[PDB]
Amino acid sequence: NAQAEEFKKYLETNGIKPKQFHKKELIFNQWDPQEYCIFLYDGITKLTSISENGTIMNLQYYKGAFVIMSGFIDTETSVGYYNLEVISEQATAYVIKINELKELLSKNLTHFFYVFQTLQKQVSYSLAKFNDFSINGKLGSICGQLLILTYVYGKETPDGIKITLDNLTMQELGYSSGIAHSSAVSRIISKLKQEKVIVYKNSCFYVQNLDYLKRYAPKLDEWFYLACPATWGKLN
Amino acid sequence: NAQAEEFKKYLETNGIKPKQFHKKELIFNQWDPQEYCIFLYDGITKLTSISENGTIMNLQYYKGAFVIMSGFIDTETSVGYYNLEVISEQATAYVIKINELKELLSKNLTHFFYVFQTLQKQVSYSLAKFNDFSINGKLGSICGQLLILTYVYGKETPDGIKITLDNLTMQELSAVSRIISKLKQEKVIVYKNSCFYVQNLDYLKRYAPKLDEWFYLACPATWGKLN
Numbered sequence: 001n002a003q004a005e006e007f008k009k010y011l012e013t014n015g016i017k018p019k020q021f022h023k024k025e026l027i028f029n030q031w032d033p034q035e036y037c038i039f040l041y042d043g044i045t046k047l048t049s050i051s052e053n054g055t056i057m058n059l060q061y062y063k064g065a066f067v068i069m070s071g072f073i074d075t076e077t078s079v080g081y082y083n084l085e086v087i088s089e090q091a092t093a094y095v096i097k098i099n100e101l102k103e104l105l106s107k108n109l110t111h112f113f114y115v116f117q118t119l120q121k122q123v124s125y126s127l128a129k130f131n132d133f134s135i136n137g138k139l140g141s142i143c144g145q146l147l148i149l150t151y152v153y154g155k156e157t158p159d160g161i162k163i164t165l166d167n168l169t170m171q172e173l174g175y176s177s178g179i180a181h182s183s184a185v186s187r188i189i190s191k192l193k194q195e196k197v198i199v200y201k202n203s204c205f206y207v208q209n210l211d212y213l214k215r216y217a218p219k220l221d222e223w224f225y226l227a228c229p230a231t232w233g234k235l236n
Numbered sequence: 237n238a239q240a241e242e243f244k245k246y247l248e249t250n251g252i253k254p255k256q257f258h259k260k261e262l263i264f265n266q267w268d269p270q271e272y273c274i275f276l277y278d279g280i281t282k283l284t285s286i287s288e289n290g291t292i293m294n295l296q297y298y299k300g301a302f303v304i305m306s307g308f309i310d311t312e313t314s315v316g317y318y319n320l321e322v323i324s325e326q327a328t329a330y331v332i333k334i335n336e337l338k339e340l341l342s343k344n345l346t347h348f349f350y351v352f353q354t355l356q357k358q359v360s361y362s363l364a365k366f367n368d369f370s371i372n373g374k375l376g377s378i379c380g381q382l383l384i385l386t387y388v389y390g391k392e393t394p395d396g397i398k399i400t401l402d403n404l405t406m407q408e409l410s411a412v413s414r415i416i417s418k419l420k421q422e423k424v425i426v427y428k429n430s431c432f433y434v435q436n437l438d439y440l441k442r443y444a445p446k447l448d449e450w451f452y453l454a455c456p457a458t459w460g461k462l463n
């Protein structure tokens with residue numbers, strides 16, 4: 001990813017070091033009065049909110065490279081009581097105090113813009129998932145999630161397009177699709193195998209009817225085309 | 237709003253005039269090759285989409301002052317096949333070609349931060365709505381929309397928090413009609429003498445708690461008025 005590498009260089013040039021995190025660590029947390037800008041270079045994370053009673057809500061998933069800001073760039077205060085939890089075995093991130101960020105993102109036009117456009121991608125991402133859920137309900141959500149997986153992590157094999165993720169759980173798939181109970185997920189996963197869309201072999205998921213995912217996640221597919229055309233084009 | 241008045245003045249300093257639009261007009265549309273930055277100064281709009289069978293989906297509401305960008309700031313290409321439709325009687329907006337926004341933001345850091353922060357408000361807004369829907373379904377969504385109306389247009393009175401929005405625009409915003417009428421039946425919101433009054437703000441806060449937190453974090457002075 002060209003413009004991701006250009007942003008890495010900018011940060012290192014200015015004395016910002018990568019940091020390594022392991023699974024289950026919080027890169028930033030909902031109880032901290034200091035807010036940060038996170039340049040997630042490598043790894044997979046999820047945004048969570050933890051209620052008083054202890055229930056954990058999974059709000060959004062990110063893979064490197066991406067930018068996540070826990071505070072507003074102007075006020076430096078929280079945008080919401082959120083944690084950024086590492087769910088891959090390792091992740092690499094640059095961690096910048098918000099105040100320190102402004103002293104930098106100014107002197108440069110191009111790098112301001114890279115972060116700007118990432119927020120734009122994210123705004124449109126949530127709108128597309130909402131549109132698909134409004135039309136096709138939970139099937140839309142799950143199809144969109146599998147579509148994402150296929151575009152980002154798919155490899156061509158004779159058994160179909162193999163999702164090359166190792167730790168992927170039926171539960172983590174539901175949370176990533178906004179469905180919190182394994183009953184709904186297994187029901188819909190059942191139909192998908194039953195309609196020959198997905199198959200499970202060798203601990204991995206293989207997609208065999210990619211057109212079907214596109215049919216039920218059409219606005220997320222649109223989003224992929226418009227925001228990630230290079231990727232999208234691999235399988236279109 | 238100060239950051240926004242200062243942004244209006246920056247646009248006029250660089251010679252951008254306001255345009256006026258009337259209800260049902262599109263400020264931008266999904267078929268235009270040119271993408272734009274809209275500085276919505278006054279009025280109420282909605283973001284719409286069309287599915288491949290002709291059905292219109294309402295995705296998002298915006299009120300002035302706010303910034304809506306139909307194209308990515310770097311590539312200048314569509315962020316999605318969206319239209320921006322006016323739902324108040326009139327709206328006032330500044331309409332800027334996307335490439336020209338880079339130039340303007342590149343030369344003033346104050347106004348770059350102001351636009352950047354409107355994207356941050358959108359992102360956190362959608363996350364809060366999702367959280368509330370995840371917990372209370374469509375009741376959470378509906379309570380949250382009424383809560384935001386209350387905080388934005390509400391005025392304390394002896395009959396409760398009056399919503400100072402004409403009943404016209406109040407109508408422009410199936411299982412929904414049932415939820416709304418149950419809130420009316422339970423006197424959360426009440427018709428009296430040709431206006432509507434929120435009489436149970438605590439109920440709205442209870443079922444849209446994450447959007448209530450969003451307003452507190454995003455607009456603390458407005459939140460504070462009614463709390």
Ligand SMILES: COc1c(Cc2cccc3ccccc23)cc(=O)n2c1SC[C@H]2C(=O)O
Binds near residue numbers: 059061129178365
């Ligand atoms: C599949 O649903 C979503 C929506 C869309 C969405 C659906 C329903 C109600 C919503 C209300 C407000 C905003 C989005 C909604 C977005 C999203 O980020 N995630 C999910 S699941 C987790 C997260 C993500 O995709 O990473």
Ligand code: NA
Binds near residue numbers: 030
């Ligand atoms: Na924090």
Ligand code: NA
Binds near residue numbers: 265266267318
């Ligand atoms: Na357009």
